[PDB]
């Protein structure tokens, strides 16, 4: 399409590309945090059910 | 030539409606070829600028009256890089770019707000209340455009909330500009509602003050001054 159209598109796509990308790290960071949070936690939940099992 | 009579001679503050100079220019351009001449890029007439220039400069405010020139400019494909408008701006003093998008947004006044400009505006000239309200407005709305981009992900009632407030406000604001037409029972149905200026500045200033941040959003649409918009909310429920 006319260059505009392309741009228009593009514009957004680029944006997206950022936005998503942004969201990607943003998430990744959150995610990362969450990742951290798992250690004692891991145990902790694992623990949590850890007995309706034996008994 | 007539108007110059009135201006200087009859003194008159002329309101000069031109619809459209565009057609003149175009007319010039049409001939250009046939004048043997080269037309121009974008088809034009090579002399366009002077043509305009001499014309635009033909009219003015002397100390022998004023010709206040309301000049309709058709803007093809609303493309303005479209040399003619591109030029025009120089001769403009206030540019009113009417936004078809906005028109499409159902708004009437359908204007392109940010491009209906006057390079002139000032916190001095128009007073800052005016000015600032506008800059704030101009600001937020452009930012709101940035936000559209968000919304595309986030949805009709889901975002980041302050930002949501402002969004909503933008939605009001939009509506608040919308204004009935006495003429246009055909476009509006409504009848014109005129806003005397202060009531406007204030109108938005108030909205900016968020005094309606609990009032409905399109309880702003096709109004006159802001009160009536408040009133209008009631009329619903």
Swiss-Prot record, chain A:
Domain of life assignment: Eukaryota
UniProt name for this protein: ATP synthase F(1) complex subunit gamma, mitochondrial
Gene that encodes it: ATP5F1C
Location in the cell: Mitochondrion inner membrane
Function description: Subunit gamma, of the mitochondrial membrane ATP synthase complex (F(1)F(0) ATP synthase or Complex V) that produces ATP from ADP in the presence of a proton gradient across the membrane which is generated by electron transport complexes of the respiratory chain. ATP synthase complex consist of a soluble F(1) head domain - the catalytic core - and a membrane F(1) domain - the membrane proton channel. These two domains are linked by a central stalk rotating inside the F(1) region and a stationary peripheral stalk.
Residues recorded as bearing N6-succinyllysine in the entry: 24
Similarity comment: Belongs to the ATPase gamma chain family.
UniProt lineage: Eukaryota, Metazoa, Chordata, Craniata, Vertebrata
Subunit structure, interactors included: Component of the ATP synthase complex composed at least of ATP5F1A/subunit alpha, ATP5F1B/subunit beta, ATP5MC1/subunit c (homooctomer), MT-ATP6/subunit a, MT-ATP8/subunit 8, ATP5ME/subunit e, ATP5MF/subunit f, ATP5MG/subunit g, ATP5MK/subunit k, ATP5MJ/subunit j, ATP5F1C/subunit gamma, ATP5F1D/subunit delta, ATP5F1E/subunit epsilon, ATP5PF/subunit F6, ATP5PB/subunit b, ATP5PD/subunit d, ATP5PO/subunit OSCP.
In-chain residues carrying the UniProt-annotated modification N6-acetyllysine: 14, 30
Swiss-Prot record, chain B:
Listed GO CC annotations: mitochondrial inner membrane; mitochondrion; proton-transporting ATP synthase complex
MF terms (GO), sorted A to Z: ATP binding; ATP hydrolysis activity; proton-transporting ATP synthase activity, rotational mechanism
N6-acetyllysine modifications at: 139, 193, 198, 235
Modified residues (Phosphoserine): 128, 146
TM spans (from-to): none
Subcellular location: Mitochondrion inner membrane
Record-level GO BP terms: proton motive force-driven ATP synthesis; proton motive force-driven mitochondrial ATP synthesis
Keyword field: Acetylation, ATP synthesis, ATP-binding, CF(1), Glycoprotein, Hydrogen ion transport, Ion transport, Magnesium, Membrane, Metal-binding, Mitochondrion, Mitochondrion inner membrane, Nucleotide-binding, Phosphoprotein, Transit peptide, Translocase, Transport
Modified positions (Phosphothreonine) in chain numbering: 25
Its biological purpose: Catalytic subunit beta, of the mitochondrial membrane ATP synthase complex (F(1)F(0) ATP synthase or Complex V) that produces ATP from ADP in the presence of a proton gradient across the membrane which is generated by electron transport complexes of the respiratory chain. ATP synthase complex consist of a soluble F(1) head domain - the catalytic core - and a membrane F(1) domain - the membrane proton channel. These two domains are linked by a central stalk rotating inside the F(1) region and a stationary peripheral stalk.
Summary of subunit composition and partner proteins: Homotrimer. Component of the ATP synthase complex composed at least of ATP5F1A/subunit alpha, ATP5F1B/subunit beta, ATP5MC1/subunit c (homooctomer), MT-ATP6/subunit a, MT-ATP8/subunit 8, ATP5ME/subunit e, ATP5MF/subunit f, ATP5MG/subunit g, ATP5MK/subunit k, ATP5MJ/subunit j, ATP5F1C/subunit gamma, ATP5F1D/subunit delta, ATP5F1E/subunit epsilon, ATP5PF/subunit F6, ATP5PB/subunit b, ATP5PD/subunit d, ATP5PO/subunit OSCP.
Listed name of the protein: ATP synthase F(1) complex catalytic subunit beta, mitochondrial
Stretch of the intact protein here: 288 to 524 of 528
């Amino acid at each position: 399409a006319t260059l505009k159209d392309i741009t228009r598109r593009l514009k957004s796509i680029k944006n997206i590309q950022k936005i998503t990308k942004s969201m990607k790290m943003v998430a990744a960071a959150k995610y990362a945090r969450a990742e951290r949070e798992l250690k004692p936690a891991r145990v902790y939940g694992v623990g949590s059910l850890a007995l309706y099992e034996k008994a | 030539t007539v108007a110059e009579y009135f201006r200087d001679q009859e003194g008159q503050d002329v309101l000069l409606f031109i619809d459209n100079i565009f057609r003149f220019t175009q007319a010039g351009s049409e001939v250009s070829a046939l004048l043997g001449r080269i037309p121009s890029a974008v088809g034009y007439q090579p002399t366009l600028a002077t043509d305009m220039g001499t014309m635009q400069e033909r009219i003015t405010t002397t100390k022998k009256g004023s010709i206040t020139s309301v000049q309709a400019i058709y803007v093809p494909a609303d493309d303005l890089t479209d040399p003619a408008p591109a030029t025009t701006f120089a001769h403009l003093d206030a540019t009113t770019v009417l936004s078809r998008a906005i028109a499409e947004l159902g708004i009437y006044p359908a204007v392109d707000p940010l491009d209906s400009t006057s390079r002139i505006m000032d916190p001095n000239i128009v007073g800052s209340e005016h000015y600032d309200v506008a800059r704030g407005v101009q600001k937020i709305l452009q930012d709101y455009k940035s936000l559209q981009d968000i919304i595309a992900i986030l949805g009709m009632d889901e975002l980041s909330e302050e930002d949501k407030l402002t969004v909503s406000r933008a939605r009001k604001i939009q509506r608040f500009l919308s204004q009935p037409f006495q003429v246009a029972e055909v476009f509006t149905g409504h009848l014109g509602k005129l806003v005397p200026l202060k009531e406007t500045i204030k109108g938005f200033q108030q909205i900016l003050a968020g005094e309606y941040d609990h009032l409905p959003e399109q309880a702003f649409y096709m109004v006159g001054p802001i009160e009536e918009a408040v009133a209008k909310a009631d009329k619903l429920a």
